[PDB]
Amino acid sequence: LINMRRYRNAARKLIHHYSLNSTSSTEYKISDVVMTMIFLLRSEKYHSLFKLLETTFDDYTCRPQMTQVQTDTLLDAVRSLLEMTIDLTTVDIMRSSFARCFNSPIMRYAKIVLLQNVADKRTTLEELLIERGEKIQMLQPQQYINSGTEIPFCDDAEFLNRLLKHIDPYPLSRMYYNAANTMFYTTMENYAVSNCKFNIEDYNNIFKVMENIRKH
Amino acid sequence: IMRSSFARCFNSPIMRYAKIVLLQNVADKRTTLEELLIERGEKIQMLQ
Amino acid sequence: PQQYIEFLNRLLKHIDPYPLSRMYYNAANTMFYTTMENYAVSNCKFNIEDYNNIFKVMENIR
Amino acid sequence: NKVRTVTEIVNSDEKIQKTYELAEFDLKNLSSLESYETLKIKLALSKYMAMLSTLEMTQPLLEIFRNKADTRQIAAVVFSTLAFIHNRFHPLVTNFTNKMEFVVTETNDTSIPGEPILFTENEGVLLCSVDRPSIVKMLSREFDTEALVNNCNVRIAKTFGASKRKDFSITEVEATQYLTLLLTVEHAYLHYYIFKNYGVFEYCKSLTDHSLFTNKLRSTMSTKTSNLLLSKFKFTIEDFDKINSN
Amino acid sequence: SLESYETLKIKLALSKYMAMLSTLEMTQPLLEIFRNKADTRQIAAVVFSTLAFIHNRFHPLVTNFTNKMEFVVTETNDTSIPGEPILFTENEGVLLCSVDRPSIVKMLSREFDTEALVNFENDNCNVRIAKTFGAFSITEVEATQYLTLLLTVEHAYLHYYIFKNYGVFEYCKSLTDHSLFTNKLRKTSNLLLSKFKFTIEDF
Amino acid sequence: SREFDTEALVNFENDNCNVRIAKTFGAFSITEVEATQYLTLLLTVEH
Amino acid sequence: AYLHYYIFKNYGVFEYCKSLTDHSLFTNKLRSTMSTKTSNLLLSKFKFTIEDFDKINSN
Amino acid sequence: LVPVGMAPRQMRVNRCIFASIVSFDACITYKSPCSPDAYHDDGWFICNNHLIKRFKMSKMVLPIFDNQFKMTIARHLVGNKERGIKRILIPSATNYQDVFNLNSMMQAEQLIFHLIYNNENAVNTICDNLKYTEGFTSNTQRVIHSVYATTKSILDTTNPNTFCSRVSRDELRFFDVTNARALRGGAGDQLFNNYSGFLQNLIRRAVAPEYLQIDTEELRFRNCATCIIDETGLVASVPDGPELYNPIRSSDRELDRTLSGYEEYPTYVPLFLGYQIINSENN
Amino acid sequence: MSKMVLPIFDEDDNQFKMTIARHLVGNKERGIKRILIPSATNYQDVFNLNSMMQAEQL
Ligand SMILES: [Zn+2]
């Protein structure tokens, strides 16, 4: 027999990381992958996801074909597992990530990669800019405010103090880490879905700019 | 501790002289005194 | 604003064996340490030469 | 490094020399600066939360962004954040002058990766484009409320010197959500500032490469304006060099 | 010997400051007085009396002294200046004396190296042996604290004299730059700050 | 409507910190932007 | 523990941490005052040593 | 929004009623002077400043005991030579309108007084006049409603506890001259009853009893009464004869050589009147 | 008795400060225990002269 609960927990954590649904970062290992796959196999509920991932053992550079019922079942299973919302885009992201992991060899060191192979034609940032901007200009403003107005600043100093107390035990370091990684992962997902190369250089140039402004 | 000590003794060869050793292999990750200092001090400061 | 406004020989004996030089040393070092602490807390640059000027005594020629 | 002091009486030559190691004062200064910066950032975050409350929207932030129908509240929140950042850079400004338009995209072919909030004029007035799906995705991504983030000597010294102390729906998760929204709107505001003050071509070039931000902003930001929120920490991509080589 | 006579004179000046303290008749030691924030009146009286004592010493022929002064005991960091625990501002004709009670308390609480250091002293073992065969107090630490406070108020009083004699502008400039009183005595002799030297060196 | 570089530029001015400190210890309007606009219009009409 | 605390109080928290890391600093930081004015350390009654210290160090 | 749905927050609260005074003329800004004491959660529902200004009274503490219990007490600010109406320390409901110059003070304070003193007719008159005066609807109406609500909240907090104290068996108080063989005492209890519940609470917090019987032990703080109560209200008068000298040293050489640091007895005149009884400590 | 001082006029420079002492007798003592300054007829009884030094008795 197996500790299906522990297997499930490891599976959930690994799936979260490989679907970029959690900013949490931790070590992972072949033990964890095996936990995940065994849990999926044993669970009647998740047989479809098990089949999906098992198919990654092959060339894995392919788009699985599913009926609408199959896709709905898979999405329901994933959403029940992670308790969230989700998307077949996330399904494909997990498929690609797990395929890369399975195809990767056993190594003495962890492999750090970037999301890719999600949703054929490679598009540049410039082409995306042109097309998206044209479509946006086509779009019309859903709502607007008039000129001037006034920022609605709060006034209750006691209220501000209460909020300050409520937030004091929150570590700014952890909050900053979580926020930055959230933004980074969402940008990664957008790029991968768009099939446009992610400019790691410019993404880091953002922080370079932050530092260059700070130093002055 | 006894398990580790006796394992070391059993694995050791017959020798004309006694072997003087230090306790080790008790409870995987090697931690430095500095890391222990940081972590324990943080937890202590948390304590009241 | 908050606010507005013989036996000394025995006490001299009491303090007589004290090393006056050590007294100055301790007092000056206490002041300097407190000044450095305040500077560090305030993140304000410190003017070593001006502090020396504070405790600088010129010597005459007689 | 270190310093030393010499005490001496004018009439006597018996001098007492003491030595000081500046590391202690360095620790004092670093702790003071860290505490001050933390207090400033928490004050700003609390102020942002408080003004959003002043708007008096019943739902919480994430629910607001999930409710696709109520574009009114999305626009209100976005404009309020943008104006707050604008004032934080220009405290004397409490409005935004020219009226503002808003649109909420709903599709990938309508959204631009890496710039969920962007700006474009209709040749008469500026329109702000919002990627509500992306906002929802960011604010919904599970956050880590457990792991910590980070010279060992000074680390230990701070550990042993600094102390610790053992009805709002806000948890660290919601605080993180607010901070993420603020940072995103700050990025968008920087883009918009470069746009307004350097032309649409410069705005497009910045979008292509943010590096221009360095000069186009530090010319005015680092001197007259409160530092960027990100300035609180130095950020970096894990395994950046190998990733670049990839 | 001679230097011992000047030492005796300096200790006599300290004893006179002690007489002033007794005249004030404080139940607690100055350390506890400063530690007790509620004793604002005691702190203000101590500072004022020390300033008057220093004024009398610096101007022996002058017995007059400002008989009323606004006082404010500061506690917050933003209410204090490093290197100037005592300040003399003016609120548009009103003379305010600001005090950095936390800094005073810190200085006083600092451990002194009384025993730690060894210094030259009258150590004739023959005299000690001859004596052996023929056969309310103040500690060294308390004396050190008391000297520290006296010298602090001496610095404050010098700044105050600059303020009164020259004006608030020159008082601020003196706060910025203390080079004015490298010469010091040039009256001043009765000020202990003119009795020794202190220096800082890169190391 | 053009944004003016009031804050952006730094120019020589009476900056005696000693005077500022001395003052501190002794202790319908027009903005710079409005003045700039008004100067611009005056010079335009001058041309 | 008292020696550690003495070094702390009279040399700052950084020096205290350094002493914790390496007690050798005790030598100067204490003998400056202890051996001269204070009763010798209790351990002073005997010279202590670790059995097979050299081989253990080589290990 | 940030806060949980409703979830009444917890913070400090200014307690003196007069803190709510504000100019009904919104175009005229006004700030009432409040002593910081108002922010202490104690039996006092008036700050030191308002107390001295309107009632000529200053707060004070009386240590009581092993365990040092602190009993609230007020003291006279009345000078020796003050006479007649000046001696009314706290006017009664039949005299407050005259003792307090309603004309000379603000309408909001007049409403506050007509609320404290149970004068519904005057309260209604003020409300209607404000309804038909100035831009009532715009903001004056809301300001008036806010002030009225604050005053009514304080009164609703006080009066129930006051009534429970009145009918209480364990705790008993009798505001009269304990020297029953006196004429200036009278039906002090009846007059105290005539007072409003909140006014009764103020009287309790201010006037200490001449005697105090705790269980079986009685403590006599005075051999005499320092104030009286009549139809006019609380009067700063000596029941037996000449008024007590009240130097009023503040607020509105050989001698010292000998009298250096030296215990000094205050010249203040605290409020001692009536009998008080209690079972157990209830503290 | 505990020494104390009672100011009378203390406005500007008129500083009439009448002296006064305080009871050190509780509300339970009586008779001899309560007598502060005994008469010549009873001081010998109030004071335990035998318990004090003969010089004090003198
Ligand atoms: Zn008040």
Side-chain angles (χ1 to χ4, degrees):
Chain A
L1 303 176
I2 60 165
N3 177 336
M4 72 291 291
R5 281 194 300 281
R6 180 187 178 193
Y7 282 64
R8 175 201 65 213
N9 302 354
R12 181 162 189 175
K13 296 169 188 178
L14 180 57
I15 290 160
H16 269 299
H17 176 65
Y18 271 17
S19 65
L20 302 179
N21 289 109
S22 172
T23 66
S24 71
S25 172
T26 181
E27 307 307 310
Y28 293 84
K29 56 187 182 179
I30 295 174
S31 196
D32 314 332
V33 181
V34 174
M35 271 315 98
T36 307
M37 292 302 291
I38 291 168
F39 175 55
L40 276 296
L41 175 56
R42 296 288 297 161
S43 171
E44 185 65 22
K45 172 179 175 184
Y46 298 118
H47 281 339
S48 295
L49 172 44
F50 175 85
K51 177 56 174 175
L52 164 66
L53 292 182
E54 170 277 339
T55 51
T56 64
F57 287 60
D58 65 26
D59 68 350
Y60 76 70
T61 54
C62 61
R63 294 181 185 279
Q65 307 304 298
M66 311 75 78
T67 72
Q68 190 53 46
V69 175
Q70 289 170 320
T71 310
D72 306 351
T73 304
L74 181 65
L75 285 166
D76 296 340
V78 169
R79 197 171 57 265
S80 180
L81 177 57
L82 306 179
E83 309 183 295
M84 301 335 307
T85 58
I86 59 153
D87 188 359
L88 60 93
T89 307
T90 67
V91 173
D92 187 54
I93 285 163
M94 294 182 286
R95 185 188 63 79
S96 175
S97 192
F98 278 107
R100 281 199 292 274
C101 189
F102 290 130
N103 183 53
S104 67
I106 304 161
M107 293 173 280
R108 299 170 182 174
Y109 304 90
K111 189 177 176 182
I112 301 166
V113 310
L114 303 174
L115 183 63
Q116 57 198 279
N117 311 329
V118 176
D120 287 339
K121 179 180 177 182
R122 171 63 67 196
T123 307
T124 67
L125 175 58
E126 298 175 357
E127 297 156 303
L128 286 173
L129 285 166
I130 292 174
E131 178 177 359
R132 299 297 200 285
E134 293 293 308
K135 290 170 180 176
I136 289 156
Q137 292 293 359
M138 183 278 288
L139 299 170
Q140 304 304 294
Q142 295 155 319
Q143 288 199 255
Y144 77 102
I145 60 173
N146 61 8
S147 73
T149 67
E150 174 183 354
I151 185 161
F153 282 131
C154 75
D155 51 354
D156 184 345
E158 173 58 17
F159 185 70
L160 284 165
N161 312 334
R162 290 182 58 74
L163 291 180
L164 288 164
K165 293 177 182 179
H166 189 82
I167 63 169
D168 291 342
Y170 297 150
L172 279 185
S173 299
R174 194 187 290 150
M175 282 194 289
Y176 264 99
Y177 163 99
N178 277 313
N181 290 295
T182 294
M183 302 212 299
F184 172 69
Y185 291 144
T186 298
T187 308
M188 171 96 68
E189 297 158 21
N190 284 350
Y191 267 93
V193 172
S194 55
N195 306 314
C196 168
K197 175 175 181 181
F198 189 109
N199 183 325
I200 295 288
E201 194 61 23
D202 190 61
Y203 201 87
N204 196 49
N205 297 352
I206 298 161
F207 312 134
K208 302 188 193 61
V209 167
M210 169 272 289
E211 285 294 350
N212 294 339
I213 298 163
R214 187 184 69 80
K215 67 184 187 189
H216 291 296
Chain B
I1 285 163
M2 294 182 286
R3 185 188 63 79
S4 175
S5 192
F6 278 107
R8 281 199 292 274
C9 189
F10 290 130
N11 183 53
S12 67
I14 304 161
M15 293 173 280
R16 299 170 182 174
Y17 304 90
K19 189 177 176 182
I20 301 166
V21 310
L22 303 174
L23 183 63
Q24 57 198 279
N25 311 329
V26 176
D28 287 339
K29 179 180 177 182
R30 171 63 67 196
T31 307
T32 67
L33 175 58
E34 298 175 357
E35 297 156 303
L36 286 173
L37 285 166
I38 292 174
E39 178 177 359
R40 299 297 200 285
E42 293 293 308
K43 290 170 180 176
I44 289 156
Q45 292 293 359
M46 183 278 288
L47 299 170
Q48 304 304 294
Chain C
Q2 295 167 355
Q3 300 299 338
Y4 306 83
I5 297 170
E6 303 181 349
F7 71 103
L8 299 181
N9 311 347
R10 177 178 180 278
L11 297 170
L12 177 60
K13 299 200 65 40
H14 275 298
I15 63 171
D16 177 59
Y18 292 163
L20 176 60
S21 175
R22 183 188 303 162
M23 301 315 78
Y24 272 142
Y25 157 86
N26 278 318
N29 279 272
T30 296
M31 293 180 183
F32 165 70
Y33 188 103
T34 301
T35 300
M36 295 299 102
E37 178 172 357
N38 294 349
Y39 268 102
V41 169
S42 61
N43 185 47
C44 182
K45 293 181 181 179
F46 169 54
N47 177 310
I48 298 157
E49 64 282 25
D50 190 60
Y51 200 88
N52 288 339
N53 296 334
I54 286 169
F55 297 98
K56 180 67 174 66
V57 184
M58 291 334 307
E59 62 91 26
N60 62 42
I61 56 168
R62 54 180 290 168
Chain D
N1 180 55
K2 297 192 174 178
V3 300
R4 64 187 186 185
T5 73
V6 176
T7 303
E8 67 189 69
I9 300 168
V10 170
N11 63 6
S12 169
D13 303 335
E14 189 161 358
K15 314 191 179 191
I16 308 166
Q17 183 174 69
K18 181 179 175 188
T19 303
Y20 292 85
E21 191 180 55
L22 303 172
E24 298 286 353
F25 301 118
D26 307 338
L27 290 162
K28 289 172 175 295
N29 177 246
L30 290 176
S31 299
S32 174
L33 289 170
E34 290 294 330
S35 304
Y36 174 23
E37 292 302 315
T38 299
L39 176 58
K40 280 196 296 186
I41 291 159
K42 285 189 178 179
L43 286 160
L45 179 64
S46 178
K47 188 174 178 179
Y48 181 61
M49 293 179 183
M51 51 85 88
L52 294 175
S53 302
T54 307
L55 280 175
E56 197 272 323
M57 172 47 176
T58 288
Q59 284 64 3
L61 183 68
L62 175 63
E63 180 169 345
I64 292 161
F65 276 112
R66 284 186 170 187
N67 185 352
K68 172 178 70 179
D70 196 344
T71 56
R72 179 174 59 168
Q73 306 255 10
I74 295 161
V77 168
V78 170
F79 174 73
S80 302
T81 313
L82 184 63
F84 161 65
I85 291 154
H86 181 84
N87 172 265
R88 183 178 174 272
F89 285 17
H90 315 282
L92 300 175
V93 182
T94 59
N95 69 80
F96 177 80
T97 299
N98 289 337
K99 79 173 176 167
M100 186 64 72
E101 283 69 355
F102 303 91
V103 63
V104 180
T105 61
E106 296 298 328
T107 65
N108 303 333
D109 62 355
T110 44
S111 169
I112 192 66
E115 305 292 343
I117 306 303
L118 57 92
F119 301 81
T120 175
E121 197 199 353
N122 56 11
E123 310 170 49
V125 56
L126 198 66
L127 160 62
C128 182
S129 163
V130 181
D131 179 347
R132 180 205 66 75
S134 292
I135 304 306
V136 168
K137 283 175 64 173
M138 293 182 286
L139 303 180
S140 298
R141 181 174 290 112
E142 181 179 5
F143 302 99
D144 184 343
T145 58
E146 317 312 323
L148 307 176
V149 176
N150 186 286
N151 180 346
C152 298
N153 304 338
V154 300
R155 285 175 183 173
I156 300 158
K158 292 169 68 178
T159 300
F160 282 107
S163 82
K164 294 181 189 294
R165 176 59 164 83
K166 188 177 179 183
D167 68 346
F168 304 98
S169 61
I170 309 306
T171 65
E172 192 180 11
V173 168
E174 292 70 23
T176 304
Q177 289 171 323
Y178 277 107
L179 171 59
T180 303
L181 176 58
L182 272 166
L183 293 166
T184 312
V185 180
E186 186 183 30
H187 182 91
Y189 170 93
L190 297 177
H191 276 295
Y192 150 71
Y193 174 95
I194 287 162
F195 168 81
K196 181 188 182 196
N197 297 342
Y198 301 101
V200 68
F201 194 74
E202 288 295 335
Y203 167 67
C204 294
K205 288 192 294 188
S206 307
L207 295 172
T208 308
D209 179 349
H210 294 90
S211 70
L212 309 164
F213 282 53
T214 300
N215 290 340
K216 290 314 197 66
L217 302 175
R218 83 195 181 83
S219 65
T220 68
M221 294 301 101
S222 71
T223 313
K224 277 73 64 172
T225 78
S226 169
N227 301 329
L228 306 175
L229 300 170
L230 296 173
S231 67
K232 180 57 172 64
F233 297 104
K234 181 183 178 182
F235 301 66
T236 179
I237 298 164
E238 183 181 2
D239 197 22
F240 180 74
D241 303 348
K242 185 178 180 182
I243 292 159
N244 274 2
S245 74
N246 301 339
Chain E
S1 178
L2 184 62
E3 59 277 23
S4 301
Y5 176 68
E6 288 86 5
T7 299
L8 289 168
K9 292 190 290 178
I10 289 161
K11 289 174 174 166
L12 175 59
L14 292 164
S15 307
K16 290 179 178 184
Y17 182 76
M18 296 299 102
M20 180 277 290
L21 294 182
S22 302
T23 305
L24 288 171
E25 200 274 324
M26 72 291 291
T27 301
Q28 290 299 304
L30 294 175
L31 171 61
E32 289 309 308
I33 292 163
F34 286 112
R35 185 189 320 299
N36 183 4
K37 60 185 77 66
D39 291 327
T40 300
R41 192 71 195 179
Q42 295 177 12
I43 296 159
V46 163
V47 174
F48 179 87
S49 306
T50 305
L51 291 165
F53 174 85
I54 299 156
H55 170 79
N56 295 334
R57 290 189 59 78
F58 178 61
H59 294 300
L61 306 171
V62 184
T63 62
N64 65 30
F65 182 76
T66 300
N67 287 307
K68 186 174 180 181
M69 185 180 288
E70 185 174 80
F71 288 100
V72 179
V73 179
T74 68
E75 189 164 61
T76 314
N77 301 339
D78 63 358
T79 51
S80 174
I81 301 298
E84 298 293 345
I86 306 307
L87 298 171
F88 299 99
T89 73
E90 179 172 334
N91 196 353
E92 303 184 352
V94 181
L95 173 63
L96 193 153
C97 175
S98 168
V99 182
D100 178 345
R101 181 203 70 74
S103 294
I104 306 306
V105 168
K106 285 180 179 181
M107 293 182 286
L108 294 174
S109 72
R110 299 212 192 282
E111 180 181 304
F112 304 112
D113 291 331
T114 61
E115 72 285 18
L117 183 62
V118 183
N119 296 96
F120 308 153
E121 220 259 351
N122 26 279
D123 306 318
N124 182 307
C125 297
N126 312 110
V127 178
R128 299 173 184 182
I129 300 158
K131 181 66 177 68
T132 306
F133 283 47
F136 182 79
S137 69
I138 308 301
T139 71
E140 184 171 343
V141 167
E142 295 163 319
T144 302
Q145 291 168 319
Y146 270 19
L147 169 64
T148 302
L149 295 172
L150 172 52
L151 292 165
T152 305
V153 184
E154 272 200 0
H155 182 80
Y157 167 87
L158 175 53
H159 278 312
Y160 173 110
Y161 163 76
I162 298 300
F163 176 92
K164 291 304 312 310
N165 184 89
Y166 305 85
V168 66
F169 176 76
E170 311 88 331
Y171 162 80
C172 297
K173 280 176 74 172
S174 170
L175 291 175
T176 302
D177 181 344
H178 290 90
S179 63
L180 171 144
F181 56 98
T182 60
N183 292 318
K184 302 182 170 162
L185 179 59
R186 189 74 172 282
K187 294 185 184 303
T188 314
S189 66
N190 303 333
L191 309 179
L192 301 177
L193 286 168
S194 61
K195 298 293 186 185
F196 74 101
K197 292 174 283 178
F198 183 75
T199 175
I200 301 158
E201 180 186 13
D202 290 350
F203 190 78
Chain F
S1 72
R2 299 212 192 282
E3 180 181 304
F4 304 112
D5 291 331
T6 61
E7 72 285 18
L9 183 62
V10 183
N11 296 96
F12 308 153
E13 220 259 351
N14 26 279
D15 306 318
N16 182 307
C17 297
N18 312 110
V19 178
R20 299 173 184 182
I21 300 158
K23 181 66 177 68
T24 306
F25 283 47
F28 182 79
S29 69
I30 308 301
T31 71
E32 184 171 343
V33 167
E34 295 163 319
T36 302
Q37 291 168 319
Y38 270 19
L39 169 64
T40 302
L41 294 172
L42 172 52
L43 292 165
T44 305
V45 184
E46 272 200 0
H47 182 80
Chain G
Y2 170 93
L3 297 177
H4 276 295
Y5 150 71
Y6 174 95
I7 287 162
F8 168 81
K9 181 188 182 196
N10 297 342
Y11 301 101
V13 68
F14 194 74
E15 288 295 335
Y16 167 67
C17 294
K18 288 192 294 188
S19 307
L20 295 172
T21 308
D22 179 349
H23 294 90
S24 70
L25 309 164
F26 282 53
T27 300
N28 290 340
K29 290 314 197 66
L30 302 175
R31 83 195 181 83
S32 65
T33 68
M34 294 301 101
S35 71
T36 313
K37 277 73 64 172
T38 78
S39 169
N40 301 329
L41 306 175
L42 300 170
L43 296 173
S44 67
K45 180 57 172 64
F46 297 104
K47 181 183 178 182
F48 301 66
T49 179
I50 298 164
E51 183 181 2
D52 197 22
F53 180 74
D54 303 348
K55 185 178 180 182
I56 292 159
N57 274 2
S58 74
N59 301 339
Chain H
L1 55 89
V2 171
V4 179
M6 284 73 74
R9 291 178 296 278
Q10 312 308 299
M11 62 305 297
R12 78 188 177 291
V13 178
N14 187 305
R15 311 303 180 82
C16 78
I17 293 170
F18 295 107
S20 67
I21 287 167
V22 295
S23 175
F24 290 151
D25 180 350
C27 295
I28 295 172
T29 185
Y30 170 87
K31 169 268 189 177
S32 175
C34 182
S35 163
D37 74 313
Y39 292 93
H40 296 290
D41 182 14
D42 50 42
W44 293 112
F45 287 115
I46 181 167
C47 72
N48 204 55
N49 296 353
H50 317 310
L51 187 62
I52 62 176
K53 194 173 192 289
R54 285 288 175 266
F55 299 99
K56 318 170 241 176
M57 294 177 70
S58 180
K59 296 177 190 181
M60 171 54 107
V61 179
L62 182 64
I64 298 296
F65 54 101
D66 305 342
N67 183 345
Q68 301 191 347
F69 293 120
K70 300 294 187 291
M71 295 298 102
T72 178
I73 178 167
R75 63 170 188 276
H76 276 164
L77 303 177
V78 179
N80 185 258
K81 312 329 297 165
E82 301 183 67
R83 298 289 177 275
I85 192 167
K86 306 298 290 296
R87 288 280 162 185
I88 293 171
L89 202 60
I90 302 174
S92 72
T94 69
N95 302 94
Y96 74 98
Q97 73 299 357
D98 310 313
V99 169
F100 293 116
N101 184 332
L102 301 165
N103 302 340
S104 70
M105 91 195 88
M106 185 180 288
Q107 289 292 328
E109 194 175 5
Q110 298 162 227
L111 170 69
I112 279 162
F113 278 127
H114 292 298
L115 291 161
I116 292 161
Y117 295 92
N118 192 353
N119 183 336
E120 291 180 351
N121 299 343
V123 166
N124 301 335
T125 305
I126 296 164
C127 281
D128 297 347
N129 295 341
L130 299 164
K131 286 173 197 169
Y132 313 124
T133 302
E134 286 293 336
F136 177 72
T137 181
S138 67
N139 302 295
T140 287
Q141 168 169 7
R142 283 191 300 288
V143 172
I144 296 155
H145 277 313
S146 302
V147 174
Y148 170 87
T150 304
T151 306
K152 182 176 184 294
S153 304
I154 285 168
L155 295 166
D156 299 343
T157 308
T158 307
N159 282 343
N161 294 335
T162 297
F163 307 152
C164 296
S165 305
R166 288 176 58 81
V167 301
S168 172
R169 185 164 163 87
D170 285 340
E171 297 188 0
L172 307 173
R173 184 69 161 86
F174 303 94
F175 294 104
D176 58 9
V177 174
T178 52
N179 173 3
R181 190 204 62 267
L183 307 171
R184 295 283 294 282
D189 290 342
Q190 296 306 139
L191 303 154
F192 179 83
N193 289 336
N194 300 337
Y195 270 84
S196 81
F198 171 80
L199 289 161
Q200 282 181 31
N201 171 79
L202 294 180
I203 295 159
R204 280 198 300 275
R205 298 294 178 189
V207 176
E210 295 169 292
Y211 302 68
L212 172 60
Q213 174 173 354
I214 299 167
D215 299 342
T216 59
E217 176 53 49
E218 181 173 10
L219 312 185
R220 181 186 192 171
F221 306 111
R222 276 284 191 285
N223 50 339
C224 54
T226 67
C227 58
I228 63 167
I229 296 167
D230 68 33
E231 57 276 18
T232 74
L234 185 61
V235 180
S237 177
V238 173
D240 76 358
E243 293 291 307
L244 298 176
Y245 170 36
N246 185 353
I248 306 298
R249 295 165 68 193
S250 186
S251 183
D252 298 350
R253 180 66 181 83
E254 185 65 29
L255 73 167
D256 288 343
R257 295 178 198 146
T258 63
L259 303 171
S260 178
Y262 196 95
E263 196 184 24
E264 174 170 271
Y265 186 74
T267 63
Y268 288 118
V269 178
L271 303 173
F272 288 111
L273 177 64
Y275 203 61
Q276 187 161 340
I277 311 164
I278 180 164
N279 291 323
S280 182
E281 294 180 0
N282 294 320
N283 297 123
Chain I
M1 269 164 211
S2 171
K3 284 192 192 184
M4 293 179 72
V5 61
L6 177 61
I8 304 298
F9 312 100
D10 270 14
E11 291 173 348
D12 183 74
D13 63 358
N14 191 343
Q15 297 304 114
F16 269 100
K17 314 222 306 191
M18 190 178 288
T19 65
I20 180 172
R22 178 183 67 252
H23 292 171
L24 306 180
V25 177
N27 61 337
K28 299 180 178 295
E29 305 87 316
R30 61 182 62 80
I32 292 165
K33 314 301 292 199
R34 198 178 302 184
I35 292 167
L36 284 170
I37 298 171
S39 84
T41 67
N42 59 345
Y43 78 100
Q44 73 298 2
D45 318 306
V46 170
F47 294 103
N48 186 335
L49 298 166
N50 304 339
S51 69
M52 57 183 72
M53 181 175 327
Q54 294 82 17
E56 195 176 1
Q57 303 171 35
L58 166 63

